[PDB]
Structure 1
């Protein structure tokens, strides 16, 4: 708000959202952390990774937990294990989920993430 450095004008912000580079895109695919994990790490939100286990809580699949298949930074979509759907020609693909609509439970640590988790701490 108060700083005059960052523009708040709508058009400009919108352009920034669409023309964002891949590193920035990786950053804004972040997810709310589940309560046990939030307690464990003292952290609100994390950038998502492939082998983690999400729970869906918005959209037509809000009963579903499951493992993440692929994340698509081009399309702003994560894909999950059993949110399968058949297409017109009788071919099964995965339903796209946007990160806000999932709450992340079990997350798989690796050294890059471990560094992030320590950095948050």
Structure 2
């Protein structure tokens, strides 16, 4: 019951409010994680380990060190490019091009949110 106009769809994703920006960061879990967590997707936070499925660096796996929640991109340690002077800068990859390999289970409010999303028993 929402509009199918392309301009109305794009005005939502460019002006998304703070509490709803987690949708831009959603990524698929690895097959082993979903065995022991019972969910298929989750939003990404700093400290997760992430592997690329698309791009010129496919197969590269590291750890998330930065997020850009307004555009939906992440920065991975060791995936850099050097500037003119030589200081490295990060390569940003969209959250839909990666698959999550391990989580950081230390929030205690992220964990029961995962359980609330119907992890099997505990």
TM-score when normalising by structure 1: 0.90
Structure 2 unmatched ranges of 5 or more: none
Aligned length: 117
2:86 is the alignment partner of 1:87: no
Match of 2:53 among 57, 60, 66: 57
Could you report, residue by residue, the CA deviation over 1:80-109 in whole angstroms, capped at 9, with x for unpaired residues? 011011012322011001001110011011
Deviation, structure 1 residue 9:
1.8
Find the counterpart in structure 1 of residue 68 from structure 2. Answer: 72
Q: Secondary structure at the match of 2:58?
A: coil
2:110 is the alignment partner of 1:113: yes
In 2, distance between residues paired with 1:43 and 1:21? 25
Aligned 8 A contact 2:51 2:62 in 1: yes
Structure 1 unmatched ranges of 5 or more: none
In 2, distance between residues paired with 1:21 and 1:90? 37
TM-score when normalising by structure 2: 0.89
Q: Secondary structure at the match of 1:26?
A: helix
Q: Secondary structure at the match of 1:97?
A: strand
